[PDB]
């Protein structure tokens with residue numbers, strides 16, 4: 001039974017229940033993430049920015065079946081075009097706006113990757129992607145406002161592929177954590 005999370009801590013407790021089993025009800029998880037009303041004081045600990053690129057800040061290690069982290073996007077910071085390594089990927093905006101651009105998986109032939117669509121994700125909205133849906137790029141296109149997002153990945157994963165927009169060629173990258181549980185992790 002899905003109740004409104006009262007706080008981030010409450011959301012985390014609820015997520016541990018929703019991931020107690022071996023499968024994932026995507027619509028239920030998205031609904032509870034969306035229902036949490038971002039309260040900046042509850043997540044300030046994790047909102048550690050870097051001047052030059054977006055940061056990944058681990059919030060909860062989950063129960064073996066998922067991770068939860070906070071990503072902090074300075075003005076103009078964005079990602080590569082990338083996949084999510086056969087995992088579910090939920091993205092909830094906590095502050096600001098992000099642009100999500102969707103791409104299809106490339107064919108073996110070297111070719112420009114042309115966007116299939118784009119949308120603006122706004123405060124408190126929860127979006128979802130998986131590899132069957134496609135690849136994406138996420139960017140804070142603002143010149144004046146940092147963005148903060150809450151991401152849930154299931155299963156956890158620590159590598160993905162970045163795709164060259166000119167050719168569709170991919171390269172494996174190891175994803176790193178700027179902090180874990182509020183502690184900077186150089």
Ligand SMILES: [Cl-]
Nearest residue numbers: 089091138151
């Ligand atoms: Cl993501």
Ligand SMILES: [Fe+3]
Nearest residue numbers: 082089136138
């Ligand atoms: Fe992503």
